[PDB]
Amino acid sequence: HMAGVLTENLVLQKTKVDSIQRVRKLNVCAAQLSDIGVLRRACNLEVLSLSLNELSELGVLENCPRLSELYLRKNRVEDLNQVLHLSDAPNLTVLTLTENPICQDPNYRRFVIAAVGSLQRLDDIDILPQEREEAYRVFPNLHAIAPPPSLYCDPAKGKIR
């Protein structure tokens, strides 16, 4: 019944710390994961690798203000608006979403850049100053857009709702 659910036990076995709040780096690639709600308390997580899982819903990551690098290659993210859960991540400089369905949506790269103001690199390609400027011209308001509802975060503050 916990098939696909990341558990506290598995995280703490792997990382050797006493609480989810003390997890700073976590690599759980290729673990058949579809539920990562346990990360709601991962307030100190900085480097997170979740590639090659079954994830479609990113709301738990609103609880991770320290996130610096986030690897999500080859998941099941189907809705571009899931990336709005990363809009308020002030320290997130590296993101990979390659091989999720959204990567083939028109204007995916511009949307992600315009949504995540801190980002310096997306999908293994650094974001140039002029690339960011152009993304904001196309999509000027994404930091104000409410992210989708989630079981695993409260509604983000400072959004049009």
Residue numbers in the entry: 0 to 160
Q: What is the paper's account of this structure, in its own sentences?
A:
Cilia and flagella associated protein 410 (CFAP410) is a protein localized at the basal body of cilia/flagella and plays essential roles in ciliogenesis. Our work revealed that CFAP410 is a bimodular protein comprising two highly conserved domains, including a leucine rich repeat (LRR) motif at its N-terminus and an oligomeric helical bundle at its C-terminus. CFAP410 was shown to localize to the basal body and interacts with NEK1 and SPATA7 during ciliogenesis and DNA damage repair. Homo sapiens CFAP410 (HsCFAP410, accession code: NP_004919) is 256 amino acids long and a number of single residue mutations, including I35F, C61Y, R73P, Y107C, Y107H, V111M and L224P, have been associated with skeletal and/or retinal disorders.
Here we report a 1.0-Å resolution crystal structure of the N-terminal domain (NTD) of Trypanosoma brucei CFAP410. In the end we obtained crystals only for the construct spanning residues 1–160, which is what NTD refers to in all subsequent structural analyses of TbCFAP410. Residues 1–138 fold into a canonical leucine-rich repeat (LRR), with five tandem repeats forming a calzone-like structure. The LRR motif contains five parallelly arranged β strands forming a flat sheet on one side and an array of four short α helices on the other. The space between the α helices and the β strands constitutes the hydrophobic core of the LRR motif and is packed with many highly conserved leucine residues. Additionally, we found that residues 139–160 of TbCFAP410 forms a long hairpin-like loop, which is tightly packed on top of the helical surface of the LRR motif. The loop makes extensive contacts with the LRR motif via six hydrogen bonds and numerous hydrophobic interactions. All TbCFAP410 truncations with the intact loop were soluble, whereas those lacking parts or the whole loop, i.e., constructs covering residues 1–149 and 1–140, were all insoluble upon expression in E. coli. This further suggests that the loop is essential to facilitate the folding and/or to stablize the structure of the LRR motif in TbCFAP410. In the crystal structure of TbCFAP410-NTD there is an extensive surface patch across all five strands of the β sheet. Location of individual residues corresponding to the five disease-causing mutations in HsCFAP410 can be clearly visualized in TbCFAP410. These residues can be grouped into three categories, including one surface residue that is fully exposed to solvent (R75), two semi-exposed residues (V37 and Y107), and two hidden residues that are completely buried in the hydrophobic core of the structure (C63 and V111).
